[PDB]
Design a protein around this ligand. Structure first.
Ligand SMILES: O=P(O)(O)OCCNS(=O)(=O)c1ccc(OC(F)(F)F)cc1
Ligand SMILES: *Cc1c(COP(=O)(O)O)cnc(C)c1O
Ligand SMILES: [Cl-]
Ligand SMILES: [Cl-]
Ligand SMILES: [Cl-]
Ligand SMILES: [Cl-]
Ligand SMILES: [Cl-]
Ligand SMILES: [Cl-]
Ligand SMILES: [Cs+]
Ligand SMILES: [Cs+]
Ligand SMILES: [Cs+]
Ligand SMILES: [Cs+]
Lengths: 268, 393
């Protein structure tokens, strides 16, 4: 499919940025997670980034560490995640769905088989957090064989060689890291380096989404103004889940309010 | 792009977030430069000799082998400052940190020995040391935690995941991903992303180099086999390295068999796990059917790393080294035997290697064989563990 390409074309037509929330699949349980995701979409999410619970999420700060732990407490497995993904796609045909994976979960049962399952359930992209471009070959090849976009990370200090590699090898979107370190709303990143955004465009990279530490509308607006196609927010969303575990109704209300505000910031 | 090969056959690699790749490249460059620098080599050798106490003895153990055709020597890493081989490579890594202009050290530890080694090297060499340790390990390793704190290190409990070594490993890498401009990650074994398996081997290889010189001096020939326990693989690769090209010399690595391989309660991923990708490397690991990382179990707290260095996986694959396992009960018997017959209290980790040597001897007592066991550490730390087991006997 061409879900990201179609989304970006439509957003471009409207002089609009993308707002893309991240959540952990099955946090705090399968049924609530499904309702969370439907709420994010109804409130204006343009695409989703969805984490499969992993025992050792070494690119994630405490907020998302705790999301993984909550999903495990609910007995969430990769198999159940794929079941969830199939249902999400069945409800929502056009929204781009990206997975946030760690390498072992992709490699476990065979790399090719992993990407084939992604294709079967209608996933659009996979970002494997602990696979740098240097190690990416079997992952990106399997992704492309199964019509999945492999997502690559462009760090703030990316040199020319890395920009060219990320531009050539990636599809769907280019992940523009706002800063070093791990995920977390407590740590704000920088303005998208204009130099990086411009070089990526020069090299015909997939459109850039800025992520890490994006927790406020002002940051979404700034990302788009700097020339990114949009922004990803994870910890700020997951914190609302964490805060409202005891009240599913208040949880959904606050998620809706937050996503609405963040999406509003992306509009022309 | 790298200066050195990040792989040993199919195993190894650099499976870290993109943000950490410059840190690994910087470290590799600094290492390659240091290895060619006679001044670095002299500083390292000076610390090893005058601070750590190298060379370590090679002890012939006559009482243990009486009445058989086995000759057994122990390489006495138990006599190194700190009480284990870990001191060798932390001094080297501390000097690399200084070479790169870094003033801060991050380290992970499970049972605490690497934390203590990191703390002592940092105290000596003027580095600020922070150590991540799973909260369950903190609780059960109060002696080592106090040692680290006495030597001025900050010990940071890790409460995520299983609150054990793998979780501390993750936390060290999370920290480094944000702090690499000022801090060096002093990884504790011959594992993790390139260049660490290479660096740790090269900074432990004096074990085998000395053993070779010492055995030639005493016996006039190379050993028939060298035997070492395998947690993450540092003491074993340090013993093996200088013998790899001596094809007549057997290399035997001993993983912990815990309660028995068949129980699933063990720490022997090289022979009984499944290849995965974790902690920066492709290697055999302890993992669920679904690919979640699991703990290693052994009576010995130090053999808790849930994977194995990629060079060991490679040496196994090509048949250059052989890997076996030893159960808790076998290790305990070897511990008691060495105490009583040689007056040496071995680490329970090292007792796995000794147990396998004792088996080689006892199974075939008329086989002429010259064996060296790497006695990776002393067992003072283990006397109550052994007490509490024999109290329930
Ligand atoms: O808003 P925050 O700070 O929680 O950041 C959201 C991150 N969620 S994600 O799936 O985009 C994401 C993207 C990349 C990650 O690591 C990597 F860069 F190494 F690949 C981890 C998570
Ligand atoms: C930590 C430890 C080991 C295991 O680590 P390796 O990296 O496999 O050497 C073995 N012996 C002792 C005494 C230890 O402290
Ligand atoms: Cl090219
Ligand atoms: Cl708010
Ligand atoms: Cl006898
Ligand atoms: Cl568990
Ligand atoms: Cl097997
Ligand atoms: Cl045999
Ligand atoms: Cs705006
Ligand atoms: Cs003998
Ligand atoms: Cs031999
Ligand atoms: Cs092991």
């Amino acid at each position: 499919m061409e879900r990201y390409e179609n989304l970006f074309a439509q957003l471009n037509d409207r002089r609009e940025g993308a707002f893309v929330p991240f959540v952990t699949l099955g946090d705090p349980g399968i049924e609530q997670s499904l309702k969370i995701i439907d709420t994010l979409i109804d409130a204006g999410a343009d695409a989703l980034e969805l984490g499969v619970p992993f025992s050792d999420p070494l690119a994630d700060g405490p907020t998302i560490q705790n999301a993984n732990l909550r999903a495990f407490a609910a007995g969430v497995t990769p198999a159940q995640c794929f079941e969830m993904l199939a249902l999400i796609r069945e409800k929502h045909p056009t929204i781009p769905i990206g997975l946030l994976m760690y390498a072992n979960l992709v490699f476990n049962n065979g790399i090719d088989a992993f990407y084939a399952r992604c294709e079967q359930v209608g996933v659009d992209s996979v970002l494997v957090a602990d696979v740098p471009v240097e190690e990416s070959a079997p992952f990106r090849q399997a992704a492309l064989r199964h019509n999945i976009a492999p997502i690559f990370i462009c760090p703030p200090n990316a040199d020319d060689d890395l920009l060219r590699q990320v531009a050539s090898y990636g599809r769907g979107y280019t992940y523009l890291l706002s800063r070093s370190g791990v995920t977390g709303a407590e740590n704000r990143g920088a303005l998208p380096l204009h130099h990086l955004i411009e070089k990526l465009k020069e090299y015909h990279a997939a459109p850039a989404l800025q992520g890490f530490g994006i927790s406020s509308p002002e940051q979404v607006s700034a990302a788009v103004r700097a020339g990114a196609a949009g922004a990803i927010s994870g910890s700020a969303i997951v914190k609302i889940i964490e805060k409202n575990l005891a009240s599913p109704k208040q949880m959904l209300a606050e998620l809706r309010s937050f996503v609405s505000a963040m999406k509003a910031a992306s509009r022309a | 792009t790298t200066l050195l090969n990040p792989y040993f056959g199919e195993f190894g690699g650099m499976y870290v977030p993109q943000i950490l790749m410059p840190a690994l490249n910087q470290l590799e460059e600094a290492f390659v430069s240091a290895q060619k620098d006679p001044e670095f080599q002299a500083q390292f050798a000076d610390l090893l000799k005058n601070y750590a106490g190298r060379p370590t003895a090679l002890t012939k153990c006559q009482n243990i082998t009486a009445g058989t055709r086995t000759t057994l020597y122990l390489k006495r890493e138990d006599l190194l400052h700190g009480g284990a081989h870990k001191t060798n490579q932390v001094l080297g890594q501390a000097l690399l940190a200084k070479r790169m202009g870094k003033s801060e050290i991050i380290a992970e530890t499970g049972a605490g020995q690497h934390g203590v080694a990191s703390a002592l090297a940092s105290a000596l060499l003027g580095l600020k040391c922070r150590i991540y340790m799973g909260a369950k390990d903190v609780e059960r390793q109060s002696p080592n935690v106090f040692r680290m704190r006495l030597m001025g290190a900050e010990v940071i409990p890790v409460h995520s995941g299983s609150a054990t070594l793998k979780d501390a490993c993750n936390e060290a890498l999370r920290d480094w991903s944000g702090s690499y401009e000022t801090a060096h990650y002093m990884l504790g074994t011959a594992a993790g992303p390139h260049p660490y398996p290479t660096i740790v081997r090269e900074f432990q290889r004096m074990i085998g180099e000395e053993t070779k010189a010492q055995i030639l001096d005493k016996e006039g020939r190379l050993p028939d086999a060298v035997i070492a326990c395998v947690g993450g693989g540092s003491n074993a690769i340090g013993m093996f390295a200088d013998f790899i090209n001596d094809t007549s010399v057997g290399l035997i690595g001993v993983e912990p068999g815990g309660h028995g391989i068949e129980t699933g309660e063990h720490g022997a991923p090289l022979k009984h796990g499944r290849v995965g990708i974790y902690f920066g490397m492709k290697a055999p690991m302890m993992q669920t059917a679904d690919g979640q990382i699991e703990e290693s179990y052994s009576i010995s707290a130090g053999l808790d790393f849930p994977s194995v260095g990629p060079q060991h996986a490679y040496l196994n694959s090509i048949g250059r080294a052989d890997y076996v396992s030893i159960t808790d009960d076998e290790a305990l018997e070897a511990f008691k035997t060495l105490c009583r017959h040689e007056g040496i209290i071995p680490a329970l980790e090292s007792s796995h290697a000794l147990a396998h040597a004792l088996k080689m001897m006892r199974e075939q007592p008329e086989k002429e064989q010259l064996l060296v066991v790497n006695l990776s550490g002393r067992g003072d730390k283990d006397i109550f563990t052994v007490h509490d087991i024999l109290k329930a006997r």
